[PDB]
Write a protein that binds this ligand. Structure first.
Ligand code: NA
Ligand code: NA
Lengths: 104, 103
């Protein structure tokens, strides 16, 4: 079978300072998987070097490639895609909304 | 120095079937470099596996990361960016137009 998504991320709202999980799963695909943030590719290495608060979790052999962000910051509000780079397959874009908690 | 572009691609028109070179060079950066095509990241391996007509040319030691396309097809018309993925650096987008002679 051809490469295909088994799970795709969706629009979500997360609180400032919490952890975000943007899910992605691919079937019949053994190549590079990575995430883009407003069109900027973050890279394929699982700990995402250069992005101290981002990493990819999940068993890559089983096809899971979830993007995690912790702690979430205001600058994380963006449109994210999961991409199978070698097959040209792109997920639906997922908008991450960051809400600031108000306290007193 | 901080990572910075030494050369960036620009808009270009290429005749259908010819070879295109979109130039990119980075200074003070040894991490991952890759190209996006209309926002689709092509990957970092210099042979660009999965893309039979694309490859990245140049020695990454010198910091040159030119995207090559041969032969150019209509499906290659797109906006291209060279990106230093670990630094968050993006080049100016470069539009590749393909010209088809008519006869
Ligand atoms: Na990281
Ligand atoms: Na290739």
């Amino acid at each position: 079978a051809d490469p295909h998504f088994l799970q795709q991320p969706e629009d979500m709202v997360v609180l400032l300072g919490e952890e975000a999980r943007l899910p992605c799963a691919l079937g019949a695909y053994r190549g590079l998987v990575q995430w883009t943030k407003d069109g900027l590719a973050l890279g394929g290495e699982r700990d995402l070097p250069g992005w101290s608060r981002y990493w990819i979790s999940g068993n890559s052999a089983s096809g899971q490639h979830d993007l995690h962000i912790k702690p979430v910051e205001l600058e994380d509000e963006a449109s994210y895609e999961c991409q199978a780079s070698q097959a040209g397959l792109r997920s639906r874009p997922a908008q991450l909304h960051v809400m600031v908690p108000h306290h007193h």
